[PDB]
């Protein structure tokens, strides 16, 4: 009609992606009962606390404090640069 | 059961605004003096 | 142990042993302790004398850059006999690392501003004067930020009862908004959560 | 990696520079969008016409409080003093004292409705599964003498709809 | 029984009631009971919204409102039944087109001197005026000195009060002047003779009550309220132009709330300083407040900045 | 003294009372020794607790549940 | 005689049907005010046009948290408003202060500073129990300016 | 005690200092008293200043007497300018607050165990 392409005379054209989704193509509801699995070492006869151990780990290891061919060691290697990452990088 | 029949509202003064109160038993239970005789 | 326990990495912990070995080597007039946090971070315990000095060495060098100052802060500990604490925190852009610099103090002893070394300690030093009470000398400006114009208590230290000492309320008897002592409508209940048995053996305090 | 934006140079030749002098002086741009991309009004408005129509929600929503009771009623709350002790804001206030038979229940239960920050920490600590955030935004009365709740305001406010509540949990309780 | 400290959210054991307590005086008393702790039951007549500017006065659950008429003998009996002290400021200026004004100082102060006496109030209180004398004056000033006679019969314990001409903040006494931009200031009556009265500052009166509110030991024994020094001059009407550098109304406007070409003009010049033997103030003290210093505040006009005020007064004589 | 606050406000109070609403229950029986008290339906109700009724005539309703229970 | 009480079906229907609310953005609650003037629930054009200058308003609104240093500012602004003014707080922090109610630098409650009328309760009230809180205030004018002139 | 003092050295330059900024206060009370459009007897404004400076009298030490100053040196920034709106100032002179008994027998009838 005469108002359909006058919406298409600007901003290119869409007619597929449209702001209000109001029409169909949505998700309906939660129909199914789900079941959430428990995997991670949940079983018996083996899983034994004191091998899984999340916590109980030591105090911060010291270094020489009060009471040699050094290369001027830096804390780590310096950073190598980045690419220019072809996408349309200009 | 144990739920209503019709309904109510959130009303500003209905007259009933419910204006809450305290729900508890008394506290220190003051002493009563003795009666008429000396 | 693997599935739920955070996998460690050694390499990061070898170097930050070295590179921190020798900044107790080349500035021994100042640095009084150094160590390695088990997560691969460093803490340099420095006398209050060097503050402008040490950073300035950390300010430029070809073996340690540390140009980016991230976080200045404080902690205030009673029963440390010198109350407060500073912690500077600096990122060296080239070498990808964090090295924190701890310097103690008191209220009365001044500490000297870091402002000519970095211009980003401009605010972070105005603040602390409000909260804890530490007084930074030779600071281009010293004023009141984060707080109202009335608080004479310097709150975040450990003696300020949470609700401050004056509630506020407006009355129409004249035309101001005036200040009457604090009167609450609920106690602020104090619960008590600290459970016995000392679940941590590794941190076990000295036997005594 | 990287990218470089706003790094370009004009071409500098008389086939181009007309195209940039047919732009400044004739306004061939600046009518491109707002001569057009504005209109483009011909789309259906999006409005939820409020007093009648209303918008979406989910079964996990949070809101006005309740206290359920089983079939023939027990006042499901046992006064175990938990939904009180995880409360960040410290709204809750509970005072038990042994009821006549000897089963324990409450006396005062008061949720302040100003302090409550709407966690979802008091829906999730109750082991006997009593106290439940309702899905109705009925609120807004005209006096702060009010919103403080007692016990016997809550129960009704939670027996006014239990057809709403008792059908949400049985969607949601299979996940947690 | 009094607990704790008198700041706010405290007790201090006294209930009260204050009738009236909307216009100038009553608003300014309750504000001194919304601090030391109380239970101030303030009723009011017709005004739903004019009473709000009051509410941030008591902390929470202290002051509480009712509705009443006052010619119904029940409306005063439903409230007071629980009370300790009850004062009464009620009454006003000009005769109403509805209330005939004759007994509103007679029947009303008695209508609340009904079951209050019966029901077991105590330390009941009422107001008088320094200038009201049962000799012939003044048509409004009269009927007020009847209450001192007629009403005192009931409730042998009163400690009924007798203050002077008062100057507040929003008050209408000293404000009738300086509203007088007009064909000119014409004193009353074009004579500089008997001005002025004892102009006590509204704080001291409203600090008197709450000083007698549990005094103790003033009941039946009436007091009168000293002014500052000393009497005063004509200059008071010049003093107005010395510094000034020259509820439930309506939607649009009213029909009559005038300057009243009636008692009003002659009520201000009635002077009659009266008996010293009344205790009457420092005993109930400790308060007395001047004029020269406290009259800038309440007076602010179209300069709003300049003051530079050096001019004072002796007393003046008869002093 | 306190009682002048709800004047005209109609004083919300609880029409029903559970102080005892319990005793109207047909106190059950089993014919066995110890029982499972999980109430009000599975996984909505008190945690499972097992009570012993051997007295003569009594029971024990676990005290979460309240509902009069015995053999 | 009866003309007055029929007149207040005009003036007491005019002031309730056009409101010019000020707002205070301060804290989280401001965003769930905006969405009242966004098109979903459309505040304006249901009779209430949104923010104007301090002088022209009727109903000011307090969002957010009121520290010490903001109290001297509010009190002043509430004054200048014309006569037919109200104060409708909202959010759990104008009612007794959300949390922060035990802090040092937060005024406790914002009723203490002004004579507040209607309340609303919760971090952000859900952009609904806002409007539900106004359709209280357009129903909280049942009052009559009759029976002050015309009784006493 | 060995720590560097702040400004003063012992008690004299110090007690030259407190004498000093007194006048900056004493010379400027009143320019404000017309500026905020607050009304008081200008002599009050010269009583409080002299009421405060006499308050902390027992101070035995430098670096305390310098500490207090650094507060006092500030305020003249805000007040001599306008960073306060009438209600950060007048709070010095407490108008509304009902009196404290401070005597004995006036306590014993009001309040428990102070
Ligand atoms: N002590 C003094 O210096 C002095 C000076 C002048 C006059 N007075 C008298 O002492 C008291 C001071 O009054 P004021 O300064 O506050 O001025 P006011 O304008 O008379 O205040 C009285 C308030 O109570 C209301 N009122 C009038 N008659 C009433 C009645 N029978 N019952 C209930 N309310 C009534 C008035 O109108 P509404 O009914 O609408 O509330 C007004 O709201 C008054 O009795 C006054 O006549 C004293
Ligand atoms: S509901 Fe859960 S938490 Fe709240 S009281 Fe009853 S038991 Fe204790
Ligand atoms: S609702 Fe949120 S805030 Fe109110 S109690 Fe439960 S958790 Fe604490
Ligand atoms: S919760 Fe407290 S902070 Fe978050 S919005 Fe409501 S009021 Fe502002």
Give your account of this protein's structure.
Chain A: Belongs to the complex I NDUFA7 subunit family. This is part of a larger assembly, with eight protein chains of eight kinds. Chain A is largely without helices or strands and 90 residues long. Chain A is flat. The longest helix of chain D is centred in the last third of the chain and has 9 residues, at 151-159. Chain F is largely without helices or strands and 71 residues long. Helices cover 0% and strands 8% of the residues of chain F. Chain D binds chain F through residues 70-76, 78, 99-105, 127-129, 150-153, 155, 173, and chain F through 12-14, 16, 18-23, 25, 39-41, 43-47, 61, 63-67. The complex binds NADP nicotinamide-adenine-dinucleotide phosphate and iron/sulfur cluster (SF4) (3 copies). Residues 87-89, 91-92, 116-119, 121-122 of chain D line the site of one iron/sulfur cluster. NADP nicotinamide-adenine-dinucleotide phosphate binds at residues 20, 22-26, 45-47, 70, 89-93, 104, 108, 127, 129, 163, 166, 247-248 of chain E.
Tag the structure with descriptive keywords.
part of a larger assembly; 8 chains; C: about 210 residues; alpha+beta; 3 helices; about 15% helix; about 25% strand; globular; F: about 70 residues; little secondary structure; two-stranded antiparallel sheet; about 0% helix; binds NADP nicotinamide-adenine-dinucleotide phosphate; binds iron/sulfur cluster; oxidoreductase; Complex I; respiratory; electron transport; NADH dehydrogenase [ubiquinone] 1 alpha subcomplex subunit 7
Order of helices and strands of chain F: EE
Cα end-to-end separation of chain F: 51 Å
Shape of chain F: elongated
Total separate domains of chain G: 1
Strand order of the largest sheet of chain F: 1-2
Level of helix content of chain G? 10-25%
**Hetero compounds:** NADP nicotinamide-adenine-dinucleotide phosphate, iron/sulfur cluster
User: What coarse outline of chain G follows from CA principal-axis ratios?
Assistant: globular
Would you report the number of β strands of chain G? 2
- Please state roughly what percent of the residues of chain F sit in beta strands, choosing from under 5%, 5-15%, 15-25%, 25-35%, 35-45% or over 45%: 5-15%
Please state the oligomeric state of the protein chains shown: part of a larger assembly
What's the count of strands of chain F?
2
In a few lines, what is going on in this structure?
The structure is cut from a larger assembly and holds eight protein chains of eight kinds. Chain C has 208 residues and is α+β, with helices and mostly antiparallel strands.
Q: Topology, please?
A:
This is part of a larger assembly, with 8 protein chains of 8 kinds.
Chain D: H1 16-21, E1 65-67, E2 94-96, E3 106-109, E4 131-133, H2 151-159, H3 169-172
Antiparallel strand pairs in D: 1-4, 2-3
Chain E: E1 18-19, H1 24-33, E2 41-44, E3 64-67, H2 75-79, E4 87-88, H3 107-111, H4 116-119, H5 144-150, E5 161-162, E6 166-167, E7 200-201, H6 202-212, E8 223-224, H7 235-243, H8 263-267
Parallel strand pairs in E: 1-4, 2-3, 5-8, 6-7
Helix pairs in contact in E: 1-6
Chain G: H1 3-7, H2 11-17, H3 31-37, E1 59-62, H4 71-80, E2 86-89, H5 131-134
Parallel strand pairs in G: 1-2
The structure holds NADP nicotinamide-adenine-dinucleotide phosphate (NAP) and iron/sulfur cluster (3 copies).
One iron/sulfur cluster (SF4) binds at residues 77-83, 126, 128, 130-131 of chain D.
